[PDB]
Design a binder for this molecule. Sequence first.
Ligand SMILES: NC(=O)C1=CN([C@@H]2O[C@H](COP(=O)(O)OP(=O)(O)OC[C@H]3O[C@@H](n4cnc5c(N)ncnc54)[C@H](OP(=O)(O)O)[C@@H]3O)[C@@H](O)[C@H]2O)C=CC1
Ligand code: SF4
Ligand code: SF4
Ligand code: SF4
Lengths: 112, 52, 208, 176, 156, 340, 96, 94, 112
Amino acid sequence: LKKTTGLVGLAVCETPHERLKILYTKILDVLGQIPKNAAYRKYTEQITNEKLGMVKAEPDVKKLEEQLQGGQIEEVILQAENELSLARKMLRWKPWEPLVEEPPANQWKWPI
Amino acid sequence: VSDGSSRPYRCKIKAPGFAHLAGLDKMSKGHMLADVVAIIGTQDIVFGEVDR
Amino acid sequence: TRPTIRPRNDVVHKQLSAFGQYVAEILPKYVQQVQVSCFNELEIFIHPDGVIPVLTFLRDHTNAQFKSLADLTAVDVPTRQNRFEIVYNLLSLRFNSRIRVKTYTDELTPIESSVTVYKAANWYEREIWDMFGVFFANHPDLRRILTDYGFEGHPFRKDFPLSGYVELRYDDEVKRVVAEPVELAQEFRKFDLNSPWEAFPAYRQPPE
Amino acid sequence: TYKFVNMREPSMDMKSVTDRAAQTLLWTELVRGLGMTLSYLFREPATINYPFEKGPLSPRFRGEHALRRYPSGEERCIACKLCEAVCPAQAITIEAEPRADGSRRTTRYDIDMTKCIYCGFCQEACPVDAIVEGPNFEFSTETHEELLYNKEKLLNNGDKWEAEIAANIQADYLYR
Amino acid sequence: SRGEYVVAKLDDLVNWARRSSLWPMTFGLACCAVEMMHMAAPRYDMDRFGVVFRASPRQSDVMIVAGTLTNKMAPALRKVYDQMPEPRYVVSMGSCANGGGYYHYSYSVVRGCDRIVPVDIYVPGCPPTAEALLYGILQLQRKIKREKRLRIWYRR
Amino acid sequence: HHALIPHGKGGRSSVSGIVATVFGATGFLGRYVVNHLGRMGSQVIVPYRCEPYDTMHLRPMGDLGQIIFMEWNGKDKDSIRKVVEHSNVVINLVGREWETKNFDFEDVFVKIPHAIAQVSKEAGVEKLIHISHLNADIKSPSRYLRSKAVGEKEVRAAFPEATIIKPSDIFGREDRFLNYFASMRWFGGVPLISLGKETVKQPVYIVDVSKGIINAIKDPDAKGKTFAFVGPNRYLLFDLVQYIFAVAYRPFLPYPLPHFAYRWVGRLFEVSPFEPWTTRDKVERVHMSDMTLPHLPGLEDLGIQATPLELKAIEVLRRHRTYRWLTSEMEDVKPAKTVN
Amino acid sequence: ASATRVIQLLRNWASGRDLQAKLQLRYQEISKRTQPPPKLPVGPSHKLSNNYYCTRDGRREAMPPSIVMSSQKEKKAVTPAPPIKRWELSKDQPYL
Amino acid sequence: VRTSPTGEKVTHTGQAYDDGDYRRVRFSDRQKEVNENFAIDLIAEQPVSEVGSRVISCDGGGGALGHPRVYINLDKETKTGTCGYCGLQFRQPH
Amino acid sequence: VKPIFSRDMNEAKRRVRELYRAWYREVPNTVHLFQLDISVKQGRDKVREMFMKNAHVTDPRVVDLLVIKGKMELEETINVWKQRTHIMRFFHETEAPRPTDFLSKFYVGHDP
Ligand SMILES: NC(=O)C1=CN([C@@H]2O[C@H](COP(=O)(O)OP(=O)(O)OC[C@H]3O[C@@H](n4cnc5c(N)ncnc54)[C@H](OP(=O)(O)O)[C@@H]3O)[C@@H](O)[C@H]2O)C=CC1
Ligand code: SF4
Ligand code: SF4
Ligand code: SF4
């Protein structure tokens, strides 16, 4: 059990595997509500399922951190929480819908 | 940003002191005036950079 | 070989192009165009409505963890109807990559504040409002930074003269520092330096 | 690649505890700082006896602007105005007309020593070596107008400092 | 006249006291302040000459305007100058303070501190070297040495 | 010969076309005159007999090169010739309310102005402006005003086309008129001869006087005319002093004093080697009621409407207020009774 | 320096270090102010043949940015770059 | 360095303040800074070099310390060739 | 068009009236704190003049932005961020009167 994560404000998680499992399952639950053909859902599910499979397969925190390549496992849980919040806000925003409006005629022309 | 001329069209300088002085308020919470002087010292702000 | 010319890294170019397509696919609602510069920099062009959604997507890990707002600024191109081009520079320390998201606005059209997403955009957006005339809606405190307390015009706007419209001096009669119309003793000498001959054929605009 | 400042744990053995207790009660570290200050008291001071002693400077020093001449005595300036063009602060005002001999000389050459940034440009830019920032740094004035130099003033400075300016240019001309 | 001699000697004493003890105020706007600190540094220590930096304007005798004076800062500079007791002397250091320097044509820069406050000695340079600033301070000391307040009082 | 076309928009960097030598510019009126000249863009040549430190306040008033300080001596004509050689206008504001060992009232108000006018006429200066108190008269009790009248006669003699401006007490921040009354608080009660009921005064604002001088320089008709500068309202001395103390929020304790006792007190203060707090001439001039001279043209002729004392009193007298009344607004004190 | 042996010992003991070995003030160790004239080398492009500027023109080799996607006309998830490798504690001094 | 009627020292540019001009006041108790050495006279004083070649090169002396090297045609007998920068004159013998 | 704060001119007029109320009540406090020598009536007249200068605006967004700028200025004045110089700059005391009749402009200078 690591004494400190090393980054101020981030505390060592006593039960990392359980927390990661719960967070990934919740992220998948939120993704389910999102339309099937939305790219966000497909990519996020792909990433989540890989992460959850890795978490379940490996019982050692250090080996899991090496496999995930997301930094210390506490940082991984923090990223999972961030993803969950994004997924929840995504549902409201509905980014998968077509472009709101095309830009003016020469709004991105440079040199002028 | 360059327009292809000999003079830059736009030059924006990102000064490290800008964001640190912006966060000075958050850092100062719960401290006294001397602590505020110390915090100003810690972020190493040169106001030529901040004001540009 | 070719010592003078800058070396080119195609690997980073392909990675940035792939991630740009990734972003365009995930958020087709707001992204209008994504281009990767030949110095390996990625730009995603967004509709003004998508600043908060696209920035929140970028900050949160949909395989992208841009959690640092390098800088926020605007470029005033008077020709365009939306004369102001808001530019966001983000840094992802997890993937050691930086991407740029750009949007447009007019003098009269507000753009949503990103203080919620990043929290470093308070002062940057205040500076954008002070120099350029862009107003950021829902900002915690929008006021002048870097300009005088009574300054009226918005500098950096390509209409504002470099010397301004007012000047400050101390007046003994009123025992006060008093503003006055600018009167330069040596008018700034405008130099026309552009050459009549084209320098870069690659960027030649179509004759139309 | 990365190093840990702090991140050290004190020993809990009775000897180390007693040492730290002595440090707290007997003020050892403050005494160490006092000893450092005393040692500095006994070290030789670094002050130079200005004005009698002057600080080191190199031949590439950028000081008061000066207008040089050829060995003949003809002014080197050929009214190129490129040195005016490269001035970052627009501190040089140049006007020229064909002189009685027919040569391209400057009727007006003014450097505002109050708008100048002493960048060192126009010494690199000027093609004929006419304008040179000389060694002088002690040209403070009691009025603002004294610092708005004129062609006559610049030529007088060049005549005054030509002996040093030529030697410094000789020293650094190969590096340029 | 004996009265003239007494006045001249008392004026000498007062001028010597004022020039020997010149206390600049801790006022530095811009890069020129760093050269001022180097002047305070051991190599050119100004304390040898009696120049001691004192923060309070009321406990200071000289204001050195080191750095660009923006239109925003000018009222504060004038306030600090006014609150400074007299005799008070102003030294303008650097091109930015002298006449605006690199930012002469900026909207936010006062094209010289002479516009806001009277200046006694102008030190050229950008940044002026610490030796140049010391030369300017000694020139101000000589200017004080040349003052004839009591002689003028006697003659008036 | 020395004629310059005006150029610019009237700013600091513009050329007004006015080259002036303001004698006695290191004084209450000189400061405002020089400031008004400099703001237009005029070249101001300042002759100074004092230490250069005292002239430093005028240095920022003009753009680079506009203000030239040249040392001059009133007794020496050659310095006057040097100062006035290249000027198209000369303004004489040299006057001391207290006599000094080296220079008495005769020298400051008669000899000096006469020498200035003669040297200006020789040099070729187009215009000359001279200042003499409105109450100036050859039979007046005060030596100051008597010498003022004699000097006016001599200046008109030397310079026939000379504008002579006769101003009343000029109230301003550096004034010795309002500050003089306010400073009387330190001595306890305010000594007044006859309690001030018998004296009527018409004070003039300093800025109005300076603007009048500048407009007179600009006005072509002003040549060879005597203008009287007076304020909008006439006040009894008692009412005016009471208003001064009210605006200063300082207790007013008027006590009548016999004229001879006041003259003796004035003699006591004359003893001071430094600038006297008050003089017998000061007491006489204060007691003397301001003359009414309808014949002479006034500020209205020059285009300036006189500012009332009520508007500008707070500027002069706020400093005399204590901490309690420092922030009190101007409107709290009602205008004093006016004898009009 | 010119310090006497007693003062040198006192200062060294007070500091806890040998101050004489490393002295802040500068002595004859400094480089001579006058130096032999230099002969600066030329650069790669100083050749009399095969030096056509078209080959070595960097600026003309710049190109307008490539447009990956334009609105106006399974796949594996991708990242901006490969994830950063964790830093390794310094061997010389892991803990200060 | 001639002196103007007003008593001012005319500059090499020929600048002198007319009696009408009011700007002469700036030197009332100060001095007008004029360089006594005039470039035209000194350049005239230099002897004309005689070279036996139709085209000669002037670098101003000192090589890289002088001025850009220029080649002067000396064919015309009537007029000496004059360096655009240096101002030195050359002519073919005879 | 997207409204800044008001969808129609009447709402912007309401906001403008609120801002005018705020300035009108603040004026005496400004005279007291800044130790200004102007009367309260004079400052309120200056406030009316500043409001009247932009009385020609007919677009709701421009009016809303003007109200925002006025609120920022009011915040500056309510605090002591603006000095007496800034407050008195609205009264152009130092500047000399500029004639507007054709003949005076013709006499004074070449300016149109
Ligand atoms: N209410 C008024 O102010 C009135 C004004 N006037 C006249 O207008 C002028 C107003 O000046 P005021 O506002 O009173 O301020 P001052 O009393 O300071 O005016 C005197 C000025 O002249 C100089 N001066 C004084 N005495 C001499 C002298 N003997 N020789 C040479 N120069 C001298 C002073 O400089 P320094 O200190 O160096 O001597 C100063 O610049 C005076 O001439 C006054 O008589 C007339 C009527 C009323
Ligand atoms: S080098 Fe100097 S003197 Fe010669 S043309 Fe250039 S600016 Fe003029
Ligand atoms: S060194 Fe002086 S003259 Fe030369 S470019 Fe710099 S500021 Fe201008
Ligand atoms: S004069 Fe030069 S060194 Fe001094 S503040 Fe300005 S830019 Fe910096």
